Amino acid sequence: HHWGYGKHNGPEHWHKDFPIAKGERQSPVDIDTHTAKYDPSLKPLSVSYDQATSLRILNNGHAFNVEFDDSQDKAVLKGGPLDGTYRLIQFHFHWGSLDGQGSEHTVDKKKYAAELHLVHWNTKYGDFGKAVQQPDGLAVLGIFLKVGSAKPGLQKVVDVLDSIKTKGKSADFTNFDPRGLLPESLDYWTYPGSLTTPPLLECVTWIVLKEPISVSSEQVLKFRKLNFNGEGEPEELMVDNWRPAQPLKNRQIKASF
């Protein structure tokens, strides 16, 4: 009985194996744009993905991870609310069964069709494992996806999905440039949160971009053809792999604009 997104193992059940699910800084959260406050102490955000080195794409049974070689300071995130350098380790998405839902964070309760998460770890901690034992160990850059025009930079990801349809499957995925998934503006909202799936560790500084990227209906439809199940097992389409908004509690969301 592994955690998942179903009726008997979904988000409302996670707290049993992961008590922190009801913690003080859980993610995602609803971003109330009018309550968010511009923060002048925020420094310019720096997304340096020019030397990013992707290696493989994996269907882990909950989503698919595009993994990067993080053995060196190549693709890094710094500036903004961040103190130090955060290295890109992987990116993945959360999406719905319908265009009307899919994102984890919401904006004034509005749900987007999907949400991209670029995961980074604070290099001051050596590696991801040590980073998730720290209050400022991770930084996840979240980007909303809306359905409209296709996102050219996303197509290479979409076309490789047929080779990793089921849980456990992976495929070589080198030379993918994540810069092709970024919107024009880097305006963002930021707040202290957690991983949105078990272990739900509260070590994330969330940076959610205001401008969503547009992807085509065809592109997201292919996301929906993936499977939660392993090869040879009954088909469970990988859809609605998002956690709903959690209590904001003692937190303030800051705006960079």
Ligand SMILES: NS(=O)(=O)c1ccc(N[C@@H]2O[C@H](CO)[C@@H](O)[C@H](O)[C@H]2O)cc1
């Ligand atoms: N949705 S998220 O960006 O908050 C998120 C949720 C779970 C993870 N899980 C961790 O992702 C790392 C990189 O894939 C793994 O190394 C590590 O074991 C695993 O717990 C990462 C980001």
Ligand SMILES: [Cl-]
């Ligand atoms: Cl189901």
Ligand SMILES: [Zn+2]
């Ligand atoms: Zn995520």
